[PDB]
């Protein structure tokens, strides 16, 4: 059973591609172990939570409310919107839209909410006040997944979204309500079966997001630990592979198994 670091390398092997990682102490923040922790790659959907972090944010400052109910048409559904296309009707409420994004990852409820504060622009300002300024969002649903080499629009670092994601889910950046609500949303993934989840035992807890993007690019990020609880952040990107779509989950899924089979140490 390979060491972590063995098997992200061996991962850059298989996949012909770069392959970023990063775990942290989610007490402490303290970085365990890393790979290419600075270098820059797509976020791909995995940017929602960051911007269901900025929704919530909003909520607490009396800016935004959970039930609000927004009603939009057939002409604002992108590809991959499972829950928004059927709600073309009845509308979805900003808890809907953040569930839909982050659990199901709906495209369209992503761009919903985009537009709810503003638009890409706004998230990045978010980060920036947050203390952020490498992770950046420029462009809205489908655009900002094509992943271009060396782009740096829409990309992160693995260790800056770690730290984003760690300050999201236990700082003191929302409100203790807004932050379980955060949580709870990842731990509903219902689309990330086949990445780190599949290598989970019975008991563990996942709170997940994932993402896909062209030119090979996947990716995850996770607060996940033993006996029902949350001990550890690990985000993993990949970006250039050829590879298939389940071969890049694969190796994900191993990644996955690494750390876990070593998590004892």
């Not at 790659?41 to 944010?57: H, Q, Y």
């Not at 009845?90 to 495209?107: Q, W, Y």
Request: net charge negative.
């Amino acid at each position: 059973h390979p060491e972590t670091l063995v098997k992200v390398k061996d991962a850059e092997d298989q996949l012909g591609a770069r392959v970023g990682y990063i775990e942290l102490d989610l007490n402490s923040g303290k970085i365990l172990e890393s790979f290419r922790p600075e270098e820059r790659f797509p976020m791909m959907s995995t940017f929602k939570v960051l911007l269901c972090g900025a929704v919530l944010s909003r909520i607490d400052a009396g800016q935004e409310q959970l039930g609000r109910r927004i009603h939009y048409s057939q002409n604002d559904l992108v590809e991959y919107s499972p829950v928004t296309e059927k709600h073309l009707t009845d509308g979805m409420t900003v808890r809907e839209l953040c569930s839909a994004a982050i659990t199901m990852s709906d495209n369209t409820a992503a761009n919903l909410l985009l537009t709810t504060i503003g638009g890409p622009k706004e998230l990045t300002a978010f980060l920036h006040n947050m203390g952020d300024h490498v992770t950046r969002l420029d462009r809205w649903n489908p655009e900002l997944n094509e992943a271009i080499p060396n782009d740096e629009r829409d990309t992160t670092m693995p260790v800056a979204m770690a730290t984003t994601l760690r300050k999201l889910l236990t700082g003191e950046l929302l409100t203790l309500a807004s932050r379980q609500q955060l949580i709870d949303w990842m731990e509903a993934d219902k689309v990330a079966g086949p990445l780190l989840r599949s290598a989970l035992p019975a008991g563990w807890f996942i709170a997940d997001k994932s993402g896909a993007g062209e030119r090979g690019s996947r990716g995850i990020i996770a607060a996940l630990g033993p006996d029902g609880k949350p001990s550890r952040i690990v985000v993993i990107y990949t970006t250039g592979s050829q590879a298939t779509m389940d071969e890049r989950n694969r190796q994900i899924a191993e990644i996955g198994a690494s750390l876990i089979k070593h998590w004892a140490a």
